Amino acid sequence: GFLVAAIQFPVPIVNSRKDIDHNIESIIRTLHATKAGYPGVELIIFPEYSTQGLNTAKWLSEEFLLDVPGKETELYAKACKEAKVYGVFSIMERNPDSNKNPYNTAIIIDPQGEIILKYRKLFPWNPIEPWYPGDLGMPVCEGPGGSKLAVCICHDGMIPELAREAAYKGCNVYIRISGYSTQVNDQWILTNRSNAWHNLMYTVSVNLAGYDNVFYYFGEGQICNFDGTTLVQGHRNPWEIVTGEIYPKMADNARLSWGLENNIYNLGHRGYVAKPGGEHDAGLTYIKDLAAGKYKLPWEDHMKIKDGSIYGYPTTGGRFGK
Amino acid sequence: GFLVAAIQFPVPIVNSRKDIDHNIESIIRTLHATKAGYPGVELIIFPEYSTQGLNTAKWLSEEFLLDVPGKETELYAKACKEAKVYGVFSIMERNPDSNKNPYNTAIIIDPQGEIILKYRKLFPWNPIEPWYPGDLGMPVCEGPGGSKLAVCICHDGMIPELAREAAYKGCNVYIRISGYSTQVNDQWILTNRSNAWHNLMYTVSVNLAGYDNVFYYFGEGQICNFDGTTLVQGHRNPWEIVTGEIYPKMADNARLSWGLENNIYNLGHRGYVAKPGGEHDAGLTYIKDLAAGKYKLPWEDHMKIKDGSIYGYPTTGGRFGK
Amino acid sequence: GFLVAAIQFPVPIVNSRKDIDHNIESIIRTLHATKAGYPGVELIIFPEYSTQGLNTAKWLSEEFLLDVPGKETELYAKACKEAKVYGVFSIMERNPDSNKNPYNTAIIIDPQGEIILKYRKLFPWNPIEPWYPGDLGMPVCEGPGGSKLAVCICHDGMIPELAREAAYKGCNVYIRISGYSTQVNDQWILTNRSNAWHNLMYTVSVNLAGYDNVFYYFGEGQICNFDGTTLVQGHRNPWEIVTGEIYPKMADNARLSWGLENNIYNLGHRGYVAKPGGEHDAGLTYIKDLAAGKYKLPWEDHMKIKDGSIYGYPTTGGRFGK
Amino acid sequence: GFLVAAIQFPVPIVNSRKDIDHNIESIIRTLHATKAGYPGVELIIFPEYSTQGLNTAKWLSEEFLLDVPGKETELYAKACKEAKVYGVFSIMERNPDSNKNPYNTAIIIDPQGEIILKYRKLFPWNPIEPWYPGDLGMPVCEGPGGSKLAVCICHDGMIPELAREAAYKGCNVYIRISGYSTQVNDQWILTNRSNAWHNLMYTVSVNLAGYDNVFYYFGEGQICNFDGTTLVQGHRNPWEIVTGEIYPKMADNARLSWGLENNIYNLGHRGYVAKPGGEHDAGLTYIKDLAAGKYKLPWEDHMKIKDGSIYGYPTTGGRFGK
Amino acid sequence: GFLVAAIQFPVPIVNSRKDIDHNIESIIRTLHATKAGYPGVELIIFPEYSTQGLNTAKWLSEEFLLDVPGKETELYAKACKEAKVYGVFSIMERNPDSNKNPYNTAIIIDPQGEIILKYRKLFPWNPIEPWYPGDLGMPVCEGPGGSKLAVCICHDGMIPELAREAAYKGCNVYIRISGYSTQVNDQWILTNRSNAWHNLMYTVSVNLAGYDNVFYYFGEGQICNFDGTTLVQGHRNPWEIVTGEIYPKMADNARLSWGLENNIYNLGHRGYVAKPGGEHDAGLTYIKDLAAGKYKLPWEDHMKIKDGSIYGYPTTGGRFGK
Amino acid sequence: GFLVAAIQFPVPIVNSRKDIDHNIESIIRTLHATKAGYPGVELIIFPEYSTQGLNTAKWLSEEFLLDVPGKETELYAKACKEAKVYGVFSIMERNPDSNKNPYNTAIIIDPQGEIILKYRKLFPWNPIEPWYPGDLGMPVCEGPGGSKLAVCICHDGMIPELAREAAYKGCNVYIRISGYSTQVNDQWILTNRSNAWHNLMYTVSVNLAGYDNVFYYFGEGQICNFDGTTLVQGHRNPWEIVTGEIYPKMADNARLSWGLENNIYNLGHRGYVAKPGGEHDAGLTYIKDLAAGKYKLPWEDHMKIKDGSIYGYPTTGGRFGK
């Protein structure tokens, strides 16, 4: 197995690129301090918004956007290389397409300083969020101790289909980085557990400590076992390092060995006792509709919130904010 | 609103058609007594295996199988008409195709005594259960108090895609009837909550009190709100009637009005704020595979349990256990 | 003893006087139904904003304000006389001084239909609430079963000095009516307990089920014993009636008999065992300051929120929002 | 921020001045052992009665009384200087006025070995306690990491007015030392939380492990955040060191920045939206009465426990015990 | 099944035979009211000291002692016959041997008004209680719904051997009536569970609401299943009626059918699988000693409390306290 | 006091003597790693089945059986000597009598490498277990920090008479080693607490992490105080080391000093206030029957499970498995 660490990082108010640089250096010191304090740690996870903070007046400006990769990711890579750990980082990424809004991005860097996974938030916390819908799917990569890692961001964790997709591609440790998991805290705890159980995989999840120079007790850290049991739940303190031992091969072995608990197999092989191989047609219209690009809820023509003019967003198209 | 009752029904050991008829009369008496005790109740729900019990040496025999509809469902129909309630019942159903095993079936009968929903368990609990995988999809019907009801059976409730399917078809009250959910108890409670939250719908779930003539404290009754909160959690007693008031239109209104919480809408309309209208393709390979009937986990090759041979079931198909 | 009921009343969105009259009829129907359902009940308590709702765009308009007493309170009076109960009601009250904003008012009406207590919210919830600070002090009246009742409103319950004041005037059952206490939920539960314990009195507290036509699971009902123990904690359901038996004389007897636990006596008689009779001056500067109208925190100079300007309220005084 | 430590100190039976000296040396070793084990600790807190034990047959004798300052406090000071920590100590203090009973005293010593705060219990746990009512008010001092410290003793923590007084004078970390917080344990936990929330400050509280050479599991350690959440609650073990990180400036910033949660400001500025500056008259009779030295409860002429002859104390005056 | 009720009865301070007669009438009224309120109830249980209270200055006087049977038990008998219930009552019983102290006695009266069980407290709560150790063993009687009832009193329930004895004689519902179990509350709850589990029987336990004219929230009501699970745990209210359905035959069936769980059988038949029939001698020295009347703890020589001298009781034997 | 450690040891599938040797070496490394990580630890406890695993196809074979003492115990002794700790080990012991089935054995080894306690499971978890009923009684030995140690195995902990026997012989720290304490987990937690309280002693209890190369989250570690409070409850992780400080002399002092709580003394001295010395006859038939070898339950002639032919065991006699 391996030791994982989820950092309840407190980000101060960010007003300039100068503040962004100090923030990056704070993350780096924290990474090193964590390896020093926990000599066995192999994976260190930082929360959503931890690089550039949460300044909604500036976060679409060019000063506030970074490239992935870029000079800042190289600094993170250098840190991961020196500390010899896998690290997970949150970056609001300048869209290579200058016409489009930036992405909300997560990267995993390995102990060699290589970016081995790049994920762009697939379901931007709408209507509040300006981030462009991610186009890299749900990737999975090799991690420490036999792990296959995947990451989702904030609201993404509320979508069980995304956890399934990760697992379907081999993920056995599903990471969630968040930056507003209070006031809907119960549902965050709930889905971290269900994402684990549904797919027989570990979940490791972290929330930002805070962002406003005042309150820094919004942080969360949760590790769930592949049976959905919460193995570790951090107390909520700024700078809290939530740690636990993970055994990816145990999740693998449960997937290989289990019968009654093997729901992920059952999904595509229902009733395999009565019908050799199981029924491969799950019998679900929404799956077929979603595959065909025609998912439509029966009540869609009667909805209220469907565009972001309740705070201020152009939803016809174009580019805005910069 | 409407008042729902979930019955923690105890079934004796079932050795004969005589015992099955006894269960039927006992269920009917319980139905009437519940209506008498709770004059406002509009929906009364009985657990999986409450009609025929769980005699695994006999459960595939003709003596132990019923037709749906048949004389027995007509008895249940008569009871629902007399009490003027909706009732949910479990029947192991003779397969009209004599080359296939029986189904594990649930019905909802209305206060007119008409069967308004027939559901055949899509995900038999394997490798222990020999039931043929269901072929009626996940139907939804009109229920009391503005509800759109759907029923799943036991193990079905572990599959989040199935809860999504019910919701997709309009369900705002998702019923789960269970027979031996204990020892998977934590995961049963968990998924009852996540099924509700993921889909912004109520869940109402019940487990059989027991089945072995000895222990009858396996019963469960759980009502979850559309935010995933457990509203009512039954005490575990044989014959316990777990009740709660349900407001289906409140769930409907959440679905029409909520933004960030509206995960079910977001699934099919990714980022309507940044992308015009939102993207309708996340790039989920498993959805495309499942839709196409080719869902295949990367590790299927090394799995230990892919038929019923561990329980001595034949592995080649056809009707068995007669 | 006497039986108390706290009603988790749901209020629709209120757009008109028509809707207000609807709430009034709904409250009256609920009052009668509660008496019918609980024939022994002697005190029925409705939440803050249950009469007029929480339309912040309209709540300061003449259409949305009532007189106390007026035709509407006479309707409530008639209901209490008919049901033979004490009732607690919330009314946003037109200020007779046209140069001042309306009050946030609570009344208790007796089983004779007489208003026996009128309280104007001493601590409006700022900066969001525009209500004029109350000018009737913290009154106490005779209630059922040997009780001396007092009512505070919402935010008022966060001020321990106010609970002390009610006790000081004889209160042994302290009622708190609330309208949007959620998100301050932990602190609401906490202070309901501390208000009871600090003063050796019961507390009975209720929160509105909801107010926005969508979510009605914000309701709370809490009854605390005079030792601070929560005796009854409601489930959160719209329309839930939270009930409990209260024994006011037991609190009186604790106040007369207890030694170490008698903190309320000790406050004004410090050390009667060492000093003859006890010292009546602890040297509490804030008490002397507050009494003199000069309470001033050392950090007031640097405070960010000291008027309603954040919500766009005028800062110079007088009547606004008409 | 800074690390605090609350020591669940077990005191053996104390029969002589010789025992008192051994006890002092035990406290000192514990202080040093704590700094060694927790290199970052800046504040180490010892419980009530930890210096002289709890021998109610001898505790009024001259052999058992110490001066503050005196040779024993100099030993504590020397320890705090060598370890470079702030320390909090409990001393039963000989009254400089030989006519009067001794005080129950707490001191805070800084890393320079200076006594920077001296507090005498204001509300002696009557009727059991012989200690003279304190005459030093509720002082506040500068502590580590931007803290302003204040201390109360045992029953004092049950009086919210004392927590308010500390806060009013700038306290942002309120310390409570106790020596009998079992059997009324719930109320201790409760008030540590409410004292924190009511005033937007941290509370750090400790109870003596035991005193009778037999049972040493009465110890408690509790750290509460300024929102009233218990951040750390020790398990109850003798010698248990309960630690946590405290961020005084965060409490300060909440006091500066918050609106809805700013109850301490509201107390003296009620309804400041409707009335510029708020109403400075809180409308509370007991505050005015207490300021004028005429606090009188309505039921005072009917009370039982008002003097300490239920165990044995002369309440007319004079000196006794020595 | 049968429905049981445990009454959290409050007793006033008892100063006279007049007060005792008052308690008797109050108990009888409560018995009838319980039957009226719960028409299905077949067993109604009152706490220890509910007849005579807990006046320790008077409790050994002739005025405070009753005969069993006597005129007072005949009153209780009449009530049980009229209500057609089984009732459990507590009576401090005059010892027919004038050279011995009175007994602490419990009776069960049947729906015919016959005393069918008389039990004298085997383990008086020492050193506080002066009752003569009981001499009727642990009797068992036929109760409602296939039950075999046994009663123990207060402190008795702390002795697992006594619960074993009741079971050994056939008991499947073990009743415990208590008078001041608080402050031993955790251990009372604990042993109610272990007594059930150890012996595969239900336990039904009640504690007096209070006894001192001031505090009446000491009441407890607890029903445990034969697996040790708490089925019902009362709220603490004076007059609270704690009810639950009990299925004695289910316990009987567990005892007949269970293997690994059948600890009560295993105790007397060690290893029937390896040794033919099982060994009937574990080599338990304390059992042999206790049987022989020579149970002696290795440390008895150094024990501090072995008589009632701490409470001022005489230590030489005979009748006292008259 | 002293520090104890309970090791949630994960044992892999064991197929040969070669696997047994690797397992022994794993235990030894774990012992050393534990002393290194916890320099103050004096007692390190390994769970049932940790030496030879749980291979029910091979565990009766000569290859799988060890002698006590033997070369393997000498390796454990050498480890305990080098690490200077007391260790507790589980060994399936070859019966010196070749006619009889092997024993399920636990040993305690001291810091000198001497086996100071040897216990053979007295009540073999029947009917599943082949182990011969133990013949060494319930021994007690001197341990670290003033402790008197005793051990029981798995199901033995469900028998309160065995805990009593240990205590009766001086035990003040009662150890339980288990290897299947899930699915009856509640009852394990329950009895660890009751065994402690009933006898005024500490309990320290551990369960095997797992055994099947798949699932290793069955582990448990629980330390209970002599009042029955759980002081430490481990999270369930493979390799988890559950530690706590134990103070045996405190248990001793409670046994010497306590009155109301002294149930272990009361057992053999009931009602000692009324009757000098107490009544030495406990009044219990089962105690006398058990001492005389004639323990017989009233329902014994109607039982089902009484021999192990439900899995496959010759219960007439002889030798089988090898």
Curated annotation (Swiss-Prot), chains A, B, C, D, E, F:
EC identifiers of the protein: 3.5.1.49
Keyword Hydrolase: yes
Activity relative to temperature: Optimum temperature is 45 degrees Celsius.
Active site: residue positions: 48, 121, 154
Activity regulation (record text): Inhibited by iodoacetate. Appears to be regulated by the fur protein, but this effect is not mediated at the transcriptional level.
One function term, GO molecular function aspect: N-carbamoylputrescine amidase activity
Catalytic activity: formamide + H2O = formate + NH4(+)
Residue ranges occupied by any CN hydrolase domain in the UniProt entry: 2-248
SUPFAM superfamilies for this protein: Carbon-nitrogen hydrolase
EC category: hydrolase
Keywords assigned by UniProt, alphabetized: Hydrolase
Pfam family, one: CN_hydrolase
NCBIfam families from the UniProt entry: PRK13287.1
Protein purpose: Is an aliphatic amidase with a restricted substrate specificity, as it only hydrolyzes formamide. Probably involved in the nitrogen metabolism of H.pylori.
Other observations noted: Asp-156 is probably not involved in the catalytic mechanism, but is probably involved instead in maintenance of the structural integrity of the amidase. Expression of the amiF gene is stimulated in a mutant deficient in arginase activity, suggesting that production of this enzyme is regulated to maintain intracellular nitrogen balance in H.pylori.
Stated name of the protein: Formamidase
Organism expressing this protein natively: Helicobacter pylori (strain ATCC 700392 / 26695)
Lineage, highest ranks first: Bacteria, Pseudomonadati, Campylobacterota, Epsilonproteobacteria, Campylobacterales
Name of the coding gene: amiF
